[PDB]
Amino acid sequence: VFNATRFASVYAWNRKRISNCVADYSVLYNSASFSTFKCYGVSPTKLNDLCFTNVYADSFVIRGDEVRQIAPGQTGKIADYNYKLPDDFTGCVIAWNSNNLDSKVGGNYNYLYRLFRKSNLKPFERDISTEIYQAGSTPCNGVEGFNCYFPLQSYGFQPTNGVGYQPYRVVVLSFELLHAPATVCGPKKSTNLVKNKCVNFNFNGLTGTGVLTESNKKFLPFQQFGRDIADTTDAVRDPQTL
């Protein structure tokens, strides 16, 4: 995703699913190659100690002054018609200048953005339609003209453009914070288990303090872990052995 040669236009933002792997987030948060690295509802360092069922890397390209629209509850052409984040987003936004790659003498027009739409996009909605936008009361019937405009427009990416207008590559990492089996964990190592003692335990990011004992609960093959009345954990399933 980050080393991808070619990025998708913001209106047709690419999505890459990450599953069943170890995520060494250091390679990102220790790198100096990024201008914007903004994580909402999460700190990247702690991601080394966390598991998830899925991660989604949404990749695209915009101009610099629109990077601010990549954030929860923002407005504008991008956040409205191209790529909308939810207000309760939990994940990271990474953006870095790509003038050396996406801009050329004479202007690179391969990257587009949607200029018109009858309504704002819902979070993580993807609209790739090229329907003629009916600005007026007259049906267009797929014919451009007065009050009938093509919904997309190219970015003018020249190397001499202002940093505000220069191309920036954007990657959006979203985590599947669900109660289900997790296949995306961090590089943190595991240790041996100690029973019948007061310990500070961490099971797949579920942290706590208590005494772990062999249970007699009739857990089902799928049950990840149990709770008591107070919505608190009462029994767990060892990630390493059943």
Partner: nanobody, 126 residues
Framework: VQLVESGGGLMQAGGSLRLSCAVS????????MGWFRQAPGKEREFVAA????????YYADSVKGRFTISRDKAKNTVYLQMNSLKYEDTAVYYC????????????????????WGQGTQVTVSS
């Protein structure tokens, strides 16, 4: 990337000719194709444009109701059907291509295009 024109040549007034322009070589994307013409001693002049997506067409006033621009995406070819030929249509006709996507089709009349064909002579006789 090359634009290869064909067709045209000599035709008597009132007749019809078709020009072709085939795009060869690796393209990332095509926004629009256009036809221009240059009569001897005169400035090169817009004739017609077509958006690659959707196929909406824009015409110079001088050719409306006479010329039709069309596209075959699979053949990466643009056509100009030149009906009701007049002496004033005598010119070298040039194919043009751009990757610039404007929301506004009429922009293709005045947009500087990136790629140009070699030009094909059309001569209208009596």
């Amino acid at each position: 990337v090359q634009l290869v024109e064909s067709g045209g040549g000599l035709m008597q007034a009132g007749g019809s000719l078709r020009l072709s322009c085939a795009v060869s070589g690796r393209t990332f994307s095509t926004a629009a194709m256009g036809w221009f013409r240059q009569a001897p001693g005169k400035e090169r002049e817009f004739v017609a444009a077509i958006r690659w997506s959707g196929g909406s067409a824009y015409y110079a006033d001088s050719v409306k109701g006479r010329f039709t621009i069309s596209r075959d995406k699979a053949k990466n070819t643009v056509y100009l059907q030149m009906n009701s030929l007049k002496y004033e249509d005598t010119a070298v006709y040039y194919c043009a291509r751009t990757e610039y996507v404007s929301y506004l089709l009429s922009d293709y009349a005045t947009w500087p295009y990136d790629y140009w064909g070699q030009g094909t002579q059309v001569t209208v006789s009596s």
